[PDB]
Amino acid sequence: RATAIERADQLAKSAVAQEKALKRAEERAQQLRARLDAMQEAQDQVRRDHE
Amino acid sequence: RATAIERADQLAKSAVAQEKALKRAEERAQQLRARLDAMQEAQDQVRRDHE
């Protein structure tokens, strides 16, 4: 019993770390999405300007 | 000990999926900035040209 409970506890905390890291990469993705946005608006607007 | 074995099993299965989640968004992270790297060049040839 002692063995099993110890293994479970360490695995659970390791999980907590796992999903925090997943969150963090997710904000990475979203902020990069936003920058991609900002460019794409800028360059279509400059197409209208030149035209 | 049974539920100690039993409960440990799922968290392992939950974890392995939790490590799987690392790859794809980070894989998306590899593929996110290439499109940045793709999109940045897009204006470059244009504005040297349309000038």
The SS3 assignment for B1 reads coil
Element (H, E) at B49: helix B2-50
Contact: A29, B25; criterion CB under 8 Å: yes
For every residue of A1-51, DSSP letters joined together read: -HHHHHHHHHHHHHHHHHHHHHHHHHHHHHHHHHHHHHHHHHHHHHHHHH-
Instruction: Return the biggest CA–CA distance within chain B.
Output: 76
- C-beta pairs of B5-8 under 8 Å, 24+ apart in sequence: B5/A4, B7/A8, B8/A4, B8/A7, B8/A8, B8/A11
What is the spatial distance between Cα A6 and Cα A34, in angstroms, rounded to a whole number?
43
From the list B31, B14, B10, B9, the residue with the least C-alpha distance to A18 is: B14
Resolution value in angstroms = 5.8
The SS3 assignment for B30 reads helix
Tokens of A3: 């063995």
CA distances from B12 to A13, A22, A31, A51, B19 (A): 12, 17, 32, 59, 10
Provide residues of B within 8 Å CB-CB of chain A: 1, 4-5, 7-8, 11-12, 14-15, 18-19, 21-22, 25-26, 28-29, 32-33, 35-36, 39-40, 42-43, 46-47, 50
Q: Which of A13, A20, A22 to mutate to test the interface with B (most CBs of B within 10 A)?
A: A22
